[PDB]
Design a protein around this ligand. Structure first.
Ligand SMILES: [Zn+2]
Lengths: 267, 90, 193, 157, 162, 372, 80
């Protein structure tokens, strides 16, 4: 356990700060006087500093017991070869660096085929968690995969891929026939809802926002992570206007890199 | 055994890095071999037969762009024919 | 289907039954909501076991058949054909025309069924019903309906419906709203007046 | 705050004492230095900031007449605009401590005569300047003087 | 930043842009013909905004639409002004659909040696600031592209590095 | 009856009225009357009939709408400058016509520091004009300029009489861009610049008088009016950060390895919680520099001991090594490379009494004296 | 080489001076070839011919490639 082993740090610092502060109380009163020209700038500062250091000792004493309340509670030769592997984890963090994703790219101008089973292995990696959502991969038309996604009791989404990249994505509710009369997945239709049609535009702006020229897996992973915030729809008020409805519209627009529900007017 | 591939990859990368370092030193000497005239002549103040070749080939490449433009327009007509085929194939 | 709140508000010391109704409609016109037509819910009881054989104008094919408290059959026309044949197991038990009659309004996919309550010909109440379309799951959007209730009712703002105590995470059903309507009828039938 | 009143009561009892610095020394000095360790081994700058961001279409300079190096200052304005015709140059009057006071402007009625256009300029001055707020800067008066020339030119043209 | 996606209905038009906008138009082809050029004006406006975000010519003022001066017949003009981190040079220009590229660069005093010194103007510390202006034309000047013309000129007025 | 109400998205409670009007002679043309009005709990507040100076555009209105959203955002800025009584010029045009700005004339200088500081900072500024940029037009910029810097850096900030520093500020979505809290934090950081520029002179007079062993020992590299660095060591192998922290009312000195000449880490951090404590007492940079110049040699091998050995430090140059849990070491650094070596496990004061857990360690000085 | 705060500073000020030392070479290169741009007009039109000739080949490089490709769907289509 480490909650007590790190909560002890404040108390073990506070007792030494008590020793140092009472030493200050002793020697500052033992320092005598430093007039610095006028006496009224000293003798009125005498009671000021005498209150200051004594009250510092007092507040240190006081904050000692609120930390004390929250806390609770071959022989040494082979011990040395144990923690070095644990500090090798820090050594892994030694060469990380904070440069991360950001680079200094210029223009990319000078002077392919992948199996659908690779797409299936891609979709199997992230479907394994988030059990409230489901993924149903299908290719009734060509090698391109379009997927049915159910979101608890809320949303039914068709997500069309092509050429291993993104093609389209249309979201509807939970009580509609997303299939056709023949039973195939619907391709060209409309969600028949003002809020859903409004947020499909946000989805189209988001798919053109996540731009990786080589790595579309993180593009679609960030897309579905963004979509995961939309299971909180009709349940969270807007962050700037307080109320849900802006002209009758609840907040939906999650901002880029900061996922919280907004409107177009609410930015 | 995955560690060996990464280190061999980085060894080839640093070999190409050293080659690029030496070739930029070479071209830096090549560009620095000729400069007498200094800067501040460069600020734009308000106060032979190769040009015939340029003028003659500009309109030839424009004419080639238009000649391929009619061809790709015919292919546009073809693709507008072909997208309606699958549209009502069933 | 969508999450519904059903309640009564009285004459409330202003003129008559329909004066407060007209005040609510002119408030809604100040907001500016368009109409979608009218609505009426009619009830009728039967007994040997109280049979609530009951109808709604929103879904005229939906013939509701309820116990006093048991299962509900949202059945078709041929069930009404079969219902006539018994007549000795389940007596007619007439004079149960407790109805809610009014109009429906729309404001950006928001729907309102507002009207007056009558015991047949004589109106002795005002039915207030608010709802939203895309409310699929129940007990997750009650803040929206509470805000909508305090937006334009002012006084007599209701809360905590009886079917909200029937907590489940599935899709809200028309039986829940329907239940609310028969609980409304039980609330109004006691006072008569 | 809690159990510190001996320390508080000692200093008030030992105050107004000439042996205070020595009584405290005698009662306290060996306790901390023994265990805890031994001892160690012309014009104001307001107008200068004002004229910095004044419009180049004004070329205002000091008056050649009147007193100098004193509290009250006077600045005669020059307007070099090809858009606007010639007008009298105008002269202000600002006393000492230019912030937080309301200055004035000179008066000469006969200079704006021989033309009703100049009389309309003067009437527009009396219209605009009488509603100017208190303690305003010279930019407001300069710009209201500038815009009234166009406001009279549109009526003249 | 410039992405144009067009949904083609029978009589309804949906336009998808980067900044999250939907546009519906009529049967008239000119209603899209003028609008694409109006957004090309915004393209030329923002071709300078993101250009300065790399090499560090810090931006001072930027507005989506301005109306200072005349009134544009096609659309609404915009204005953006920046300054160099290297001292004396700042860029001020207003671009419009019909009146675009009005470049008046800003220069300090005691450099052209022509701005007059008043009697009150006696201290030299305030004289190093960017008082006067000078118009620089967009014609008979180097650069084969719109940003290529300006990038040569902003890198021209620079301190001596050699 | 022919009117429309237009509200600025950034600036609500204000409206544009286009009183569209007809011409009787021409049955196929129109006219407009453009007005300005504010809406409050709502009431109309003012009127401004706007002046006379294929036909389906009305660029006159869009010309107006631009000058709506590009000028009245300046209303709250000039409002609060007088409301807290700051000398400031009003609505202007910055140079070329397509521009607007507000120039601040004077600032209320200071408190709590000797007043000769107030002059030179008033001498250091010449201009305090503000500008607005950024997306949604909510990014204020303030390039507050400073001539006659006390001291440059070893980098190429060694140039002429100007230090212009961009100071950007932005309010919340609610309580708009004219917000008193935004200038409230503006005076905070300037005070933070002020308290450090206060200490700039307070060591600039301590600049010409140094023993100058710290000149070649330690080199100043980064001065930025807010932070200061040193790069110390004979190999310039470590660095210390100098930066004020207002909510702490403290300085968070960062002991850090710089340069490709070190072993495992910076390793000055054993005394980290102790060096911070001493500079609570002193605002004197030499106090920091000289302690390093003394403890460089003994602490070089103190941290290199195995672990058996540990670093539990008492006071500065009161360093206390301890072998396991029964033997102890005392090391006391001093100037000119002097270290005082106590027994550790003895008692200084009692020969009747000793330490319970540390059984006394005799014979230590003989092992020292053989080194002697 | 042979507690994090040195690392964040060390990876910073090297890089920020390294982008400092790089962007000025651009402006130095901006100086050097603007010198060559304005002191002589011939190296401008040499490189202008150089880019269009290299465009002239790659234009021609694809069109009879396209034509050979055009010949490809010939027999692909008579397979029925
Ligand atoms: Zn909102």
């Amino acid at each position: 356990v480490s909650v007590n082993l790190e909560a002890f740090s404040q108390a073990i610092s506070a007792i030494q700060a008590l020793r140092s502060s009472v030493s200050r109380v002793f020697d500052c009163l033992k320092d005598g006087m430093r007039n610095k020209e006028t006496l009224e700038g000293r003798e009125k500062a005498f009671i000021a500093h005498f209150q200051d250091n004594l009250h510092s000792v007092n507040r240190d004493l006081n904050e000692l017991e609120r930390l004390s309340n929250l806390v609770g509670k071959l022989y040494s030769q082979l011990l040395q070869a144990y923690k070095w592997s644990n500090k090798l984890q820090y050594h892994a963090g030694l060469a990380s660096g904070l440069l991360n994703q950001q680079s200094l790219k210029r223009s990319a101008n000078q002077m392919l085929v992948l199996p659908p089973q690779y797409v299936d292995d891609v979709i199997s990696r992230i479907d394994r968690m988030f059990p409230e959502m489901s993924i149903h991969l299908s290719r009734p038309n060509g090698t391109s995969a379009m997927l049915l996604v159910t979101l608890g009791k809320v949303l039914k989404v068709i997500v069309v891929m092509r050429s291993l990249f993104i093609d389209r994505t249309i979201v509807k509710g939970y009580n509609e026939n997303v299939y056709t009369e023949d039973g195939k997945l619907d391709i060209w239709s409309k969600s028949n809802y003002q809020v859903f049609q409004k947020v499909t535009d946000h989805a189209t702006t988001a798919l053109l926002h996540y731009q990786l020229p080589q790595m579309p897996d993180v593009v679609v992973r960030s897309f579905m992570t963004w979509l995961r915030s939309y299971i909180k729809l009709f349940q969270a008020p807007c962050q700037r206007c307080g109320k849900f409805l802006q002209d009758g519209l609840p907040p939906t627009w999650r901002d880029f890199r900061t996922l919280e529900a907004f409107h177009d007017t609410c930015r | 055994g995955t560690y060996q591939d990464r280190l061999t990859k980085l060894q080839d990368n640093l070999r190409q890095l050293s080659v690029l370092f030496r070739k930029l030193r070479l071209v830096y000497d090549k560009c620095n071999e000729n400069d007498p005239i200094p800067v501040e002549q460069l600020i734009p103040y308000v106060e032979s037969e190769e040009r015939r070749e340029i003028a003659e080939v500009n309109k030839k490449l424009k004419q080639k762009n238009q000649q391929l433009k009619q061809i790709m327009d015919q292919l546009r007509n073809l693709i507008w024919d072909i997208n309606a085929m699958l549209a009502m194939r069933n | 289907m969508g999450v519904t709140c059903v309640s009564q508000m009285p004459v409330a010391e202003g003129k008559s039954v329909q004066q407060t109704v007209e005040l609510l409609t002119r408030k809604l016109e100040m907001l500016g909501a368009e109409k979608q037509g009218t609505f009426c819910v009619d009830c009728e009881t039967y007994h040997t076991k109280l049979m609530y054989v009951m109808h709604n104008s929103e879904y005229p094919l939906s013939c509701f058949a309820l116990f006093e408290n048991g299962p509900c059959l949202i059945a078709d026309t041929n069930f009404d054909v079969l219902m006539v044949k018994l007549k000795g197991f389940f007596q007619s038990a007439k004079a149960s025309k407790i109805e809610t009659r009014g109009t429906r309004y729309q404001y950006c996919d928001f729907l309102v069924k507002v009207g007056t309550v009558t015991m047949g010909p004589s109106a002795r109440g005002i039915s207030v019903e608010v709802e939203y379309g895309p409310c699929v799951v129940a007990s997750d959007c009650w803040s929206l309906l509470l805000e909508f209730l305090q937006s334009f009712l002012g006084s007599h703002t209701p809360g905590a419906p009886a079917v909200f105590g029937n907590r489940h995470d599935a899709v809200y059903g028309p039986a829940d709203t329907m239940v609310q309507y028969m609980e409304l009828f039980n609330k109004i039938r006691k006072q008569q007046q | 705050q809690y159990l510190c009143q001996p320390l508080l009561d000692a200093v008030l009892a030992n105050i107004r004492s000439p042996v205070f610095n020595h009584s405290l020394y005698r009662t306290f000095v060996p306790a901390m230095t023994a265990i805890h360790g031994p001892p160690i081994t012309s014009i104001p700058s307001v107008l200068q900031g004002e004229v910095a961001r004044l419009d180049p279409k004004f070329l205002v300079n000091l008056d050649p007449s009147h007193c100098s190096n004193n509290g009250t200052v006077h600045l005669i304005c020059k307007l070099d605009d090809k858009d606007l015709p010639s007008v009298p140059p105008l002269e202000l009057s600002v006393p000492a401590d230019y912030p937080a006071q309301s200055p004035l402007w000179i008066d000469r009625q006969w200079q704006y005569d021989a033309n009703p256009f100049l009389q309309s300029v003067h009437r527009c001055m009396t219209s605009r300047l009488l509603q100017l707020p208190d303690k305003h800067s010279v930019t407001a008066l300069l710009n209201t003087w500038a815009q009234s020339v166009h406001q009279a030119c549109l009526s003249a043209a | 930043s410039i992405q144009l996606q067009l949904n083609i209905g029978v009589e309804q038009i949906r336009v998808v842009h980067r900044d999250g906008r939907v546009i519906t138009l009529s049967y008239q082809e000119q209603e899209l013909q003028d609008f694409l050029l109006s957004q090309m004006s915004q393209h030329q406006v923002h071709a300078v905004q993101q250009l300065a975000k790399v090499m560090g010519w810090q931006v001072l003022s930027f507005s989506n639409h301005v109306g200072l001066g005349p009134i544009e017949s096609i659309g609404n003009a915009s204005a953006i002004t920046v300054a160099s981190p290297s001292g004396d040079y700042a860029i001020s220009v207003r671009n419009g659909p019909e009146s675009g590229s009005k470049i008046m660069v800003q220069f300090p005093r005691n450099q052209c040696k022509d701005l007059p010194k008043s009697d009150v103007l006696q201290d030299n510390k305030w004289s190093h600031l960017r008082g006067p202006f000078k118009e620089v034309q967009w014609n008979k000047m180097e650069g084969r592209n719109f940003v290529y013309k300006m990038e040569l000129l902003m890198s021209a007025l620079s301190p001596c590095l050699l | 009856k022919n009117k429309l109400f237009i509200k600025l998205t950034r600036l609500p409670q204000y409206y544009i009225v286009v009183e569209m009007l007809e011409v009787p002679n021409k049955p196929t043309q129109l006219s407009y009357k453009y007005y300005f009005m504010s809406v409050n709990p709502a009431m109309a507040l003012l009127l401004q009939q706007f002046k006379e100076n294929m036909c389906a555009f009305n660029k006159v209105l869009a010309h107006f709408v631009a000058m709506c959203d590009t000028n009245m955002p300046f209303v709250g800025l000039r409002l609060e400058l007088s409301n807290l009584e700051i000398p400031h010029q009003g609505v202007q045009v910055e140079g070329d016509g397509f521009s607007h700005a507000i120039r601040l004339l004077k600032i209320p200088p200071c408190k709590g520091i000797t007043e000769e500081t107030q002059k030179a900072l008033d001498r250091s500024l010449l201009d305090c004009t503000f500008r607005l940029q950024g997306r949604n037009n909510r990014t204020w910029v303030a390039e507050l300029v400073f001539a006659n810097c006390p001291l440059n850096g070893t980098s190429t900030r060694e140039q002429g009489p100007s230090r212009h520093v961009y100071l950007t500020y932005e309010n919340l979505l609610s309580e708009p861009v004219g917000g008193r809290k935004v200038v409230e934090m503006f005076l905070n950081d300037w005070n933070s610049i002020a308290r450090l520029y206060e200490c700039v002179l307070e060591f600039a007079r301590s600049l010409p008088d140094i023993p100058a062993h710290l000149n070649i020992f330690s080199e100043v590299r980064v001065y930025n009016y807010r932070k200061l660095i040193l790069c110390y060591g004979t190999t310039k192998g470590s660095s210390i950060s100098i930066q004020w922290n207002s909510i702490h009312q403290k300085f968070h000195i960062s002991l850090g390895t710089v340069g490709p000449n070190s072993g495992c880490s910076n390793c000055h951090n054993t005394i980290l919680h102790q060096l911070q404590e001493m500079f609570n007492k002193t605002p004197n940079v030499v106090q920091l520099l000289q302690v390093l110049f003394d403890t460089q040699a003994p602490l070089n091998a103190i941290n290199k001991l195995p672990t058996c050995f540990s670093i539990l430090p008492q006071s500065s140059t009161h360093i206390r090594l301890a072998f396991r849990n029964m033997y102890c070491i005392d090391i006391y650094c001093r100037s000119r490379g002097v270290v005082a070596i106590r027994d550790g496990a003895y008692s200084l004061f009692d020969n009747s009494k000793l330490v319970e857990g540390f059984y006394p360690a005799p014979g230590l000085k003989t092992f020292l004296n053989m080194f002697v | 080489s042979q507690d994090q705060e040195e690392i964040r500073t060390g990876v910073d000020q090297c890089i920020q001076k390294f982008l400092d030392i790089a962007r000025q070479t651009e402006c130095f290169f901006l100086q050097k070839r603007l010198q060559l741009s304005v002191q002589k007009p011939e190296q401008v039109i040499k490189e202008d011919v150089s880019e269009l000739r290299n465009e002239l080949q790659r234009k021609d490089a694809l069109v009879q490639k396209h034509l050979t490709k055009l010949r490809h769907w010939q027999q692909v289509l008579e397979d029925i």
